[PDB]
C-alpha cells in the first residue's frame, strides 16, 4: 500500500507558515481551555493518535489519509477527548480550506510543541485525504494498563525502537489525564515542553493506587501521576537507562524527540525524490508576533 506525498497545488513554505501562525495565534487566544492548560497538549495528542493507527506491515492507518475526520475513527474510545482538538482546528481549516486534513492535524501537533517551547520539528506537506473506507478500525492505539513488554511490542508496529519509544513518551510532560476520557485522572497540567517526565519518573516517590474509575495508576505526594505504561519505563532496565539519559540531558531529549515525532508523523508516507525539503517553521516569538 503506497501513499505518495502530493503538495497542495501551488503552495510553499510561506503558505504553511501562515497556517502555523493561525494555529499558534489561536493557541494563545483560547488560553482558558482545560483549566488554563490551553490546547497545546491535546493538539500534540491528536497528532500522535492520527499517526498511531499506522501498521508498517501493510501501510493501513497513518497520518496520510486524514481519516480522523470520519466517525469510526473520531469515535474510537482511544480518542476520547480529541474532539476538542478537532474543534479547535475547525476555524483554521475553514480559513485555509486548501490544506489537507492529515497535513492540518500533524501540523497542529508540530505547532503546539514549538509554541510550548519544545524543539523545532521539521514538517513535510503532501498528505492527501482518502475516503471513508480507508479509515482504520478502532483498536490500533495502545492500552495504558500494561507493562514494558507490551509497550516495546506495541511500538514495533510503528517501527519505533527503545530510544524512540522513550523519547516519544516524554510528551507526557504535557497536559493531563481526564477520568472522563480515559479512566485515569491527574497529572502535571503543564503546557511547557521540557524533559520533566523523566525527572519526575526518577525523582518522585510513587505509590500504586486505584483511581475513581477502579484503574491502577502511580501517584506522587507532589500531585504527579504516571500510567502503568509510563512507569514501565523505569521497571525495564533498558528503558531505565534511556530515561536517565534524557533526565540528564535536555538537549539530547529535544533532538531525539524531534526526530521521533517527525518520523511518527511521516510514517506510511512516500516522499517523491523532488518533494520540497522539510519545513522548519518559525515560532510567533521568533517572528515578533
Tell me which residues are annotated as active site: 49
**Rg of the chain's alpha carbons, rounded to an integer?**
18
**Could you give the CA distance from residue 62 to residue 118 in angstroms, rounded to a whole number?**
23
Give the three-class secondary structure for 144. Answer: coil
How near is the Cβ of 117 to ligand HEM at its closest, in Å? 14
Those residues whose C-beta lies under 8 Å from the C-beta of residue 108, and which sit 6 or more positions away, are 23, 43, 46, 47, 85, 88, 89, 92
41 contacts ligand HEM (rule: CB under 6 A) = yes
End-to-end CA distance of the chain: 42
Using the Cα atoms of residue 7, residue 9, residue 11 and residue 17 in order, give the sign of their dihedral. Answer: negative
65 or 108: CB nearest ligand HEM: 108
34 or 129: CB nearest ligand HEM: 34
Give the three-class secondary structure for 189. Answer: strand
Residues 108, 40 contacting (CB under 8 angstroms) = no
42 or 99: CB nearest ligand HEM: 42
| Nearest residue relative to ligand HEM (C-beta) | 175
44 contacts ligand HEM (rule: CB under 6 A) = yes
Q: Of all helices (H) and strands (E), which one includes residue 40?
A: helix 40-51
Task: Return the percent helix, strand and coil in the chain, to nearest 5.
Answer: 50, 10, 40
Nine cell digits for residue 231: 512507569
144 contacts ligand HEM (rule: CB under 6 A) = yes
176 contacts ligand HEM (rule: CB under 6 A) = yes
Task: Determine which residue in the list 151, 201, 233, 269 makes contact with ligand HEM, applying CB under 6 A.
Answer: 151
86 contacts ligand HEM (rule: CB under 6 A) = no
5 or 174: CB nearest ligand HEM: 174
**Could you give the CA distance from residue 92 to residue 185 in angstroms, rounded to a whole number?**
30
The pattern of x and - marking residues 96 through 135 that bind ligand HEM according to CB under 6 A reads ----------------------------------------
19 or 116: CB nearest ligand HEM: 116
- Site residues (CB under 6 A) for ligand HEM, limited to 208-237: 227, 229
**Edge-first strand listing for the sheet containing 225-226:** 206-210, 216-220, 225-226
57 is in an annotated binding site: no
Question: Which range of residues in 13-21, 55-63, 171-179, 266-274 is near ligand HEM by CB under 6 A?
Answer: 171-179
81 contacts ligand HEM (rule: CB under 6 A) = yes
Give the three-class secondary structure for 195. Answer: coil
**Could you give the CA distance from residue 8 to residue 151 in angstroms, rounded to a whole number?**
36
Question: Which range of residues in 39-47, 60-68, 244-252, 276-284 is near ligand HEM by CB under 6 A?
Answer: 39-47
171 or 234: CB nearest ligand HEM: 171
Task: Determine which residue in the list 182, 190, 194, 283 makes contact with ligand HEM, applying CB under 6 A.
Answer: 182
Nine cell digits for residue 179: 477520568
Can you say which residues are annotated as belonging to the binding site for heme b? 172
Binding site for ligand HEM (CB under 6 A): 41-42, 44-45, 48, 81, 142, 144, 151, 168-169, 171-172, 174-178, 181-182, 184, 227, 229, 261
Annotated binding-site residues read: 172
Amino acid at each position: 500500500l503506497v501513499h505518495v506525498a502530493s503538495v497542495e497545488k501551488g503552495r510553499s513554505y510561506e503558505d504553511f507558515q501562515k497556517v502555523y501562525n493561525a494555529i499558534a495565534l489561536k493557541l494563545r487566544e483560547d488560553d482558558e481551555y482545560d483549566n488554563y492548560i490551553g490546547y497545546g497538549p491535546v493538539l500534540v495528542r491528536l497528532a500522535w493518535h492520527i499517526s498511531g493507527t499506522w501498521d508498517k506491515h501493510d501501510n493501513t492507518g497513518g497520518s496520510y489519509g486524514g481519516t480522523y475526520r470520519f466517525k469510526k475513527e473520531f469515535n474510537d474510545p482511544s480518542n476520547a477527548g480529541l474532539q476538542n482538538g478537532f474543534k479547535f482546528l475547525e476555524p483554521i481549516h475553514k480559513e485555509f480550506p486548501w490544506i489537507s486534513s492529515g497535513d492540518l492535524f500533524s501540523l497542529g501537533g508540530v505547532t503546539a510543541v514549538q509554541e510550548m517551547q519544545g524543539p523545532k520539528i521539521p514538517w513535510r506537506c503532501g498528505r492527501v485525504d482518502t475516503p471513508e473506507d480507508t479509515t482504520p478500525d478502532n483498536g490500533r492505539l495502545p492500552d495504558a494498563d500494561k507493562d514494558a513488554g507490551y509497550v516495546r511490542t506495541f511500538f514495533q508496529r510503528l517501527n519505533m525502537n527503545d530510544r524512540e519509544v522513550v523519547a516519544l513518551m516524554g510528551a507526557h510532560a504535557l497536559g493531563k489525564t481526564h477520568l472522563k476520557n480515559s479512566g485515569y485522572e491527574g497529572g502535571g497540567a503543564n503546557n511547557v515542553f521540557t524533559n520533566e517526565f523523566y525527572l519526575n519518573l526518577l525523582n518522585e516517590d510513587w505509590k500504586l493506587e486505584k483511581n475513581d474509575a477502579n484503574n491502577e495508576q502511580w501517584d506522587s505526594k507532589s500531585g504527579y501521576m504516571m500510567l502503568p505504561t509510563d512507569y514501565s519505563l523505569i521497571q525495564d532496565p533498558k528503558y531505565l537507562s534511556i530515561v536517565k539519559e534524557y533526565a540528564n540531558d535536555q538537549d539530547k531529549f529535544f533532538k531525539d524527540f524531534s526526530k521521533a515525532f517527525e518520523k511518527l508523523l511521516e510514517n506510511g508516507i512516500t516522499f517523491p525524490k523532488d518533494a520540497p525539503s522539510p519545513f522548519i517553521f518559525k515560532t510567533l516569538e521568533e517572528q515578533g508576533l
